[PDB]
Design a protein around this ligand. Structure first.
Ligand SMILES: Nc1nc2c(ncn2[C@@H]2O[C@H](COP(=O)(O)OP(=O)(O)OP(=O)(O)O)[C@@H](O)[C@H]2O)c(=O)[nH]1
Ligand SMILES: CN[C@@H]1CCc2c(ccc(O)c2O)[C@H]1O
Lengths: 232, 331, 52, 282
């Protein structure tokens, strides 16, 4: 009676003291969700049920989730990831001709479905446009033209404020920027400043992807704070 | 040929239950005096979870309960004195369900790792791990101290043997994700609500489906038997709740309002079965009248959407959880 | 898969079902009989309320 | 004009108390407003409430009746409370500015930097330093002036005026105003720089598909505070440095213009979706 009540309070205090230590670790970690189009080469990106990985850059802890145990066209489980910092979307940009409705259109439909969601209404997306060397190799050779698959490409011009590389043939730059604009117009169509999209061009020999993720997360948090304080 | 016969058989089932509809439930209960106005107040508030809460299960003694959260914890409370008894950290941070054994010696857990874990309270360490599902677990209930039934996202349910960790029987027939299940008072039948807007009645001993109900038009989120055991209620994401009768093989009443457009997350009955409590996405709960389909109360003390709900065995209190990492006891 | 679906329909179709009036009467009688036990319908005194 | 001036002074008292009490109850009654940033706001609200409840009514009575009736001890108590409330309200704006600076410039370490215990320690330290510069040098008669008019004022029982030395009028002015001003300026320049830098990047990447807000917000925040408190803290030094150049009425007018600032803080730091629904609920 009298002794039993004191015993319960003793165990509660020890547990509540442990929960304070766990709260410090929980609040200092950033969670990321990794998605793919099915054959986008996202395993190479992470190489260099649910699968979890941990990494640290500049004394900041990141923790990324990859889902491979569930494969369906109705993502009922996606409402759990409404508190993550950002979503990483990996798409193969060199699969316009491949049909096995081509794969770029399916990837665009998936991106459009994810963007306009009731739960992911305040979450930014980091977009990786993988397989650039394959795209350049396919574009440079003839008999394979995006016009035969994307009729809108017949009236596209490379933007004046573009950033071509040193040795690129100007043919490939137009295709790259067309593919990027396809995602960008969907991103900006329904955006009200609550979240943005950060597209990048990625290859197989790239090694600075973790720096890109770090900088994009920093920008995401800074923009969130600026919008919160009515400064943006 | 094969497809043609199915359409002919479907009409026979529909016509069979059309002649039995002599009168409606609401027509019979027109002379019953209304229950009136029901007002409830919060008695306790439980704090300590670091993230949103998805699951909750009362104890058989109506004193202790368990809850789950996305931070990776499984806390057992003392609702009377508001004292934490246990805090089990989970290997995987993605949890969707939890259960509390009738004897009180075990607790189950599951989620996005396609695995159900059983913990030994009175010994806390992992006792068994059940594998074989190819989709995320949605619910789990203890039949006994040595057997448990689970539902997953691979459109199947299973009955497990805890001692050997092997599936005794498997239930198939759904086409979408199975979202919830509930056991009968005598533990011989159970019902399941899936994403194809259908509910089914299974036989644990034999392993065959008995009846199918398809009155809804969206994904079914929650399900619960009537205390008698001859009826059950469902809740979908079209802001409607429906009552189905096992013996009549058809639905009897619908609970909806023109000012509600959000989805429904959980349902539960009261001790006598007169009241029906349902949680919604508009951050608050509602109380219905089972025999009349009219509102009688509102519980609006939660900041974020309510994800779970439960009523004690003796019917003394109602517990609700929401995404603001808080539990509340309403009396 | 077609054969299995048709077989289930035939098994489920041949069942005996009672009219809605009997089920409604049974539910109403159960609710009327077990009404006094329900603590949520009528508030209990604070002397016998463990939460107050 | 007594009835006209008495009516206006009564309205100012009601506005200060009504706004500050509403903010205090909204934060305490609701669990969604219990934030580290809101502790500074509630400290500021408490300071302004005490100021508008104690300093203003007795000063209004003294101005209207033209005499002091509460004796030679309550006059010194009133002066001490006046200085304590003025000093501790300006110094909280500095804390809010530094909090926003740390939140925006260093986003990754913000959670580790600020903790409820640290916020409580900072608030207690601010209040302690505010109390060390008002009650201690006044109740110990270290601020007393030496001229014949000053001693004649001090030796009476119905006259309660303000006379001070060079050292006190300079040190108190510096501590109350000048350091927080430069700190706030340095903070809010960097905040504006970061905001405009982030704006340039969004419109490089997605300009063709689709800094007024930051400028307006910073302009309001700095302008109200400066226009309220700068002339008084200028004449405070000036009238001590040069004698017989400022009348006894300009001092009171500028001091009351500064007092009025206490009724504007809820209109500046309490405009958000989480506050405008809490006010509607109440
Ligand atoms: N040239 C080139 N080849 C690539 C690139 N990425 C992947 N590949 C090739 O494509 C193959 C696919 O590798 P993975 O990354 O493991 O593909 P995956 O695991 O099936 O990817 P997902 O199914 O989408 O998860 C590799 O064996 C590579 O040879 C790339 O960026 N450039
Ligand atoms: C009587 N009015 C006083 C006079 C001097 C003074 C004030 C406020 C803050 C200070 O640091 C001061 O030195 C005024 O409120």
């Amino acid at each position: 009676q009298r002794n039993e009540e004191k015993a319960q309070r003793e165990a509660n205090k020890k547990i509540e003291k442990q929960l304070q230590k766990d709260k410090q670790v929980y609040r200092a970690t950033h969670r990321l969700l990794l998605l793919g189009a099915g054959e986008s080469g996202k395993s190479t990106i992470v190489k260099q049920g649910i699968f979890e990985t941990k990494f640290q850059v500049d004394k900041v802890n990141f923790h990324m989730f990859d889902v491979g145990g569930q494969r369906d066209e109705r993502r009922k489980w996606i409402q759990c990831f409404n508190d993550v910092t950002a979503i990483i979307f990996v798409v193969a940009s060199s699969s316009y001709n491949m049909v096995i409705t081509n794969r770029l259109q399916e990837a665009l439909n998936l991106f459009k479905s994810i963007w306009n969601n009731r739960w992911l209404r305040t979450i930014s997306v980091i977009l990786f446009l993988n397989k650039q060397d394959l795209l350049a190799e396919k574009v440079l050779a003839g008999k394979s033209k995006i016009e035969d698959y994307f009729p809108e490409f017949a009236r596209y011009t490379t933007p004046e404020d573009a950033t071509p590389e040193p040795g690129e043939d100007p043919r490939v730059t137009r295709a790259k920027y067309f593919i990027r604009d396809e995602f960008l117009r969907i991103s900006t169509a329904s955006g009200d400043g609550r979240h943005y999209c950060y597209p990048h061009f990625t290859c197989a020999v790239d090694t600075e992807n973790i720096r890109r993720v770090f900088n994009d997360c920093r920008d995401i948090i800074q923009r969130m704070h600026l919008r919160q304080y009515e400064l943006l | 040929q094969l497809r043609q016969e199915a359409e002919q058989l479907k009409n026979q089932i529909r016509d069979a239950r059309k002649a039995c509809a002599d009168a409606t439930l609401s027509q019979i209960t027109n002379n019953i005096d209304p229950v009136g106005r029901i007002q409830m107040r919060t008695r306790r508030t439980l704090r300590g979870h670091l993230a949103k809460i998805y699951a909750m299960h009362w104890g058989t003694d109506s004193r202790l309960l368990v809850s789950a959260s996305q931070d990776g914890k499984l806390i057992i409370w003392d609702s009377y004195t508001t004292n934490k008894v246990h805090a089990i950290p989970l290997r995987s941070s993605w949890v969707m369900t939890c259960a509390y054994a009738p004897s009180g010696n075990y607790v189950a857990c599951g989620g996005l790792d396609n695995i159900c874990s059983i913990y030994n309270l009175k010994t806390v360490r992992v006792s068994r791990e059940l594998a074989g599902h190819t989709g995320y677990l949605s619910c789990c209930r203890f039949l006994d101290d040595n057997q448990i039934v689970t539902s997953s996202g691979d459109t199947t349910c299973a009955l497990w043997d805890i001692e050997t960790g092997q599936q005794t029987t498997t239930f198939t027939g759904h086409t979408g994700d199975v979202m919830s299940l509930s056991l009968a008072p005598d533990t011989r039948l159970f019902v399941s609500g899936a994403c194809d807007a259908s509910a089914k009645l299974w036989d644990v001993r034999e392993g065959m489906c008995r009846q199918t109900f398809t009155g809804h038009e969206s994904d079914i989120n929650a399900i619960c038997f009537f205390p008698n055991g001859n009826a059950f209620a469902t809740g979908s994401d079209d802001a409607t709740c429906r009552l189905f009768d096992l013996r009549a093989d058809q639905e009897l009443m619908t609970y909806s309002h023109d000012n509600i457009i959000c989805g429904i997350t959980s349902v539960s009955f009261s001790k006598s079965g007169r009241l029906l409590l349902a949680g919604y996405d508009d951050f608050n709960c509602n109380v219905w009248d089972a025999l009349k389909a009219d509102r009688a109360g509102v519980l609006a003390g939660h900041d974020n959407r309510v994800s779970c709900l439960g009523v004690t065995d003796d019917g003394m209190a109602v517990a609700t959880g929401s995404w603001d990492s808080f539990l509340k006891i309403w009396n | 898969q077609a054969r299995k679906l048709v077989e289930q329909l035939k098994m489920e179709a041949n069942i005996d079902r009672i009219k809605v009036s009997k089920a409604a009467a049974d539910l109403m009688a159960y609710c009327e009989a077990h009404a006094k036990e329900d603590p949520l319908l009528t508030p209990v005194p604070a002397s016998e309320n463990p939460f107050r | 004009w007594v009835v006209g001036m008495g009516i206006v002074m009564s309205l100012i008292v009601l506005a200060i108390v009504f706004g500050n009490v509403l903010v205090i109850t909204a934060i305490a009654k609701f669990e969604r407003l219990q934030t580290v940033t809101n502790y500074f706001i509630t400290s500021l609200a408490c300071a302004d409430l005490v100021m508008g409840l104690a300093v203003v009514p007795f000063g209004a009575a003294h101005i209207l009746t033209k005499t002091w009736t509460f004796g030679n001890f309550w006059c010194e108590f009133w002066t001490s409370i006046d200085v304590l409330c003025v000093t501790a309200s300006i110094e909280t704006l500095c804390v809010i500015a530094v909090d926003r600076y740390f939140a925006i410039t260093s986003p990754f370490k913000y959670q580790s930097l600020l903790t409820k215990n640290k916020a409580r320690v900072i608030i207690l330290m601010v209040w302690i330093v505010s109390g060390l510069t008002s009650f201690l040098p006044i109740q110990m008669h270290w601020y007393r002036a030496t001229h014949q008019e000053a001693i004649n004022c001090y030796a009476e029982e119905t006259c309660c005026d303000f006379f001070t030395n060079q050292a006190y009028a300079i040190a108190s002015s510096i501590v109350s105003f000048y350091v927080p001003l430069v700190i706030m300026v340095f903070v809010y320049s960097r905040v504006f720089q970061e905001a405009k830098r982030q704006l340039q990047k969004i419109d490089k990447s997605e300009g063709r598909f689709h800094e007024h807000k930051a400028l307006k917000t910073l302009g309001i925040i700095m302008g109200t505070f400066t226009l309220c408190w700068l002339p008084f803290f200028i004449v405070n030094i000036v009238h001590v440095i040069q004698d017989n150049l400022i009348r006894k009425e300009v001092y009171i007018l500028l001091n009351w213009i500064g007092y009025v600032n206490s009724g504007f803080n809820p209109l500046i730091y309490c405009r958000s979706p989480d506050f405008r629904i809490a006010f509607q609920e109440l």
